[PDB]
Amino acid sequence: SEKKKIEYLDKTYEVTVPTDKIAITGSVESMEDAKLLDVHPQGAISFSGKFPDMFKDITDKAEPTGEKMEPNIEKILEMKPDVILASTKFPEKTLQKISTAGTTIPVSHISSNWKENMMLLAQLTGKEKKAKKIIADYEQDLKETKTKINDKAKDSKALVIRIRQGNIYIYPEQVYFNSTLYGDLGLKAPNEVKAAKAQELISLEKLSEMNPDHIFVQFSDDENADKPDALKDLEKNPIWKSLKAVKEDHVYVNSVDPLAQGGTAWSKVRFLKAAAEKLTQNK
Amino acid sequence: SEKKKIEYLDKTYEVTVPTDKIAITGSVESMEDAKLLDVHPQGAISFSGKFPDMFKDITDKAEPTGEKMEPNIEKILEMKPDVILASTKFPEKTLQKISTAGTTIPVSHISSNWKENMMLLAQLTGKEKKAKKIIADYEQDLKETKTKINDKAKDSKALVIRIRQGNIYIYPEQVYFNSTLYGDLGLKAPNEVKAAKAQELISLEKLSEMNPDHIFVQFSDDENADKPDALKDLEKNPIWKSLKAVKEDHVYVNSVDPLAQGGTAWSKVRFLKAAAEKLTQNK
Numbered sequence: 001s002e003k004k005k006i007e008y009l010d011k012t013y014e015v016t017v018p019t020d021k022i023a024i025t026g027s028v029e030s031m032e033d034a035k036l037l038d039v040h041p042q043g044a045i046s047f048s049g050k051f052p053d054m055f056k057d058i059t060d061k062a063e064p065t066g067e068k069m070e071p072n073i074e075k076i077l078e079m080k081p082d083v084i085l086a087s088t089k090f091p092e093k094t095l096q097k098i099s100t101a102g103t104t105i106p107v108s109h110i111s112s113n114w115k116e117n118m119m120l121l122a123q124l125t126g127k128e129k130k131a132k133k134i135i136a137d138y139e140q141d142l143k144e145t146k147t148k149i150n151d152k153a154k155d156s157k158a159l160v161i162r163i164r165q166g167n168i169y170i171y172p173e174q175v176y177f178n179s180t181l182y183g184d185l186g187l188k189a190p191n192e193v194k195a196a197k198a199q200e201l202i203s204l205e206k207l208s209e210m211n212p213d214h215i216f217v218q219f220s221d222d223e224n225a226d227k228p229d230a231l232k233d234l235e236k237n238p239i240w241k242s243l244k245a246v247k248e249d250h251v252y253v254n255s256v257d258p259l260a261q262g263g264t265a266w267s268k269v270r271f272l273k274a275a276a277e278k279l280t281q282n283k
Numbered sequence: 284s285e286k287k288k289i290e291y292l293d294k295t296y297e298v299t300v301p302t303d304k305i306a307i308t309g310s311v312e313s314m315e316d317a318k319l320l321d322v323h324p325q326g327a328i329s330f331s332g333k334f335p336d337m338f339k340d341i342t343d344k345a346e347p348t349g350e351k352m353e354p355n356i357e358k359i360l361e362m363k364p365d366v367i368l369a370s371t372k373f374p375e376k377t378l379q380k381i382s383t384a385g386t387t388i389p390v391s392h393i394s395s396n397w398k399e400n401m402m403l404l405a406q407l408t409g410k411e412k413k414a415k416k417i418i419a420d421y422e423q424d425l426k427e428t429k430t431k432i433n434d435k436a437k438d439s440k441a442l443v444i445r446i447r448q449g450n451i452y453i454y455p456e457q458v459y460f461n462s463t464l465y466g467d468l469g470l471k472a473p474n475e476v477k478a479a480k481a482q483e484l485i486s487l488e489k490l491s492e493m494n495p496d497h498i499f500v501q502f503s504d505d506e507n508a509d510k511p512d513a514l515k516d517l518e519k520n521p522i523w524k525s526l527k528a529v530k531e532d533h534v535y536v537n538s539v540d541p542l543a544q545g546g547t548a549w550s551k552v553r554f555l556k557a558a559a560e561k562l563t564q565n566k
């Protein structure tokens with residue numbers, strides 16, 4: 001390892017590379033990048049004090065850096081990391097604080113930067129060849145999938161909902177799995193999604209007015225602890241039962257791990273595989 | 284749907300086919316078959332009163348049939364199923380009781396019957412072509428994977444452990460993921476595995492004596508509720524750290540969903556994909 005210059009989102013950083021002494025704080029994106037690149041960081045984000053089962057693969061050599069939006073500077077300092085992957089979600093004051101603990105790179109949470117985020121981690125870990133192949137395969141699989149989806153499915157109304165604390169949410173067009181569903185696969189975002197500025201509640205009646213052809217439903221028990229029957233109560237509702245998607249057996253619950261971030265390389269790869277299976281002409 | 288004759292494990296059954304009026308009780312195998320075949324049964328097994336997140340994809344039209352080994356005959360009777368998929372784990376008295384509720388087929392829990400179990404569900408649902416393709420692809424992918432694993436990896440010591448209630452368990456040679464690891468991929472089962480007659484505790488000291496080249500570790504938070512830090516406490520143990528697999532970064536935690544049964548078609552398909560990635564010569 002020598003100190004190498006890293007360009008990331010038009011900013012220059014200097015980091016000892018390749019390295020495993022990576023502490024991830026705030027950037028759940030980078031944890032999903034670690035998952036895809038088989039990187040085992042020294043520090044990772046805790047979720048209610050735990051490492052989720054979906055992250056145990058890459059936290060096997062990790063200690064917690066704090067909860068997502070509460071960096072534990074003492075914990076980070078103790079690791080003496082070569083690089084801290086923080087997030088653009090952190091205010092400047094917080095990023096400055098983290099930097100007293102080591103070289104800090106704020107990783108973007110914007111889905112359109114998915115390739116740049118994975119390439120950053122690849123450059124830190126000597127895994128450029130692997131990352132470039134994953135990106136190349138995704139582009140190829142996406143083109144192939146789009147060829148295999150007929151014009152009717154392409155023109156259909158698809159929607160991603162997530163159930164959290166028993167409520168139903170939709171997401172902006174470029175956020176969550178919508179950046180794959182609409183931005184990559186080229187399905188048309190409904191007006192409700194175009195109007196959303198962040199995670200947005202919808203009602204069952206609005207869902208019924210939308211009446212999508214396809215509904216991807218994400219439900220994590222970990223995010224519904226107090227409402228564990230929320231999905232089954234929805235599924236029993238006569239208005240849900242009347243939905244075209246329900247009638248046509250076009251509702252896909254947990255097609256991707258329900259804790260998935262949605263807009264990262266790992267999430268996109270998994271969602272593409274799922275959407276391929278559900279939307280392609282063989283069906 | 285007409286009544287069709289179904290041959291399953293050298294027994295003849297008569298069932299209205301194709302059907303969606305399938306109630307699954309006891310056979311978690313059949314729920315993983317439903318997952319792989321995209322079958323949405325009318326009745327499915329509850330797990331501590333819930334449908335696990337890994338099964339929400341195929342329980343979207345299901346009501347519970349009871350816990351795995353406590354069939355709820357009232358619930359099953361209410362469904363008026365065309366067929367009940369029960370399990371060979373049930374005593375004859377219990378299978379007779381279930382049969383008062385509908386035509387009952389005891390699905391085998393033995394991993395070597397994985398193809399027969401998936402073909403049974405395929406025959407009930409008109410999905411023979413899909414099931415035959417999945418089996419054909421698995422055979423082909425398995426042959427390909429075996430070609431791609433070099434003789435050194437083939438001769439290496441691999442082990443599957445599962446952590447439950449904070450304890451470490453291994454499994455017989457033909458049980459869990461061992462039927463893929465050893466029986467299909469052709470790696471050699473260690474003596475401890477050959478000696479196991481069922482899920483068997485091992486100690487960290489015995490693991491260290493084994494010193495496998497590769498360790499697959501399965502850990503579900505749902506099965507460790509009272510010991511959530513059991514894996515991290517293991518991973519911090521100096522004796523764990525001294526393991527060759529740990530030193531060589533050859534420990535794979537939750538390579539497959541940790542609630543996976545291990546010996547079913549779905550589990551085998553997922554484990555094969557994982558083992559391919561970890562054991563093939565590119566590494």
Ligand SMILES: [Cl-]
Pocket residue numbers: 049050051064515
């Ligand atoms: Cl921890």
Ligand SMILES: [Cl-]
Pocket residue numbers: 141144145273276
């Ligand atoms: Cl594809």
Ligand SMILES: [Cl-]
Pocket residue numbers: 229231232333334339
């Ligand atoms: Cl449910």
Ligand SMILES: [Cl-]
Pocket residue numbers: 232332333334347
């Ligand atoms: Cl339920």
Ligand SMILES: [Cl-]
Pocket residue numbers: 424427428556559
């Ligand atoms: Cl393969």
Ligand SMILES: [Cl-]
Pocket residue numbers: 050051056512514515
């Ligand atoms: Cl952990």
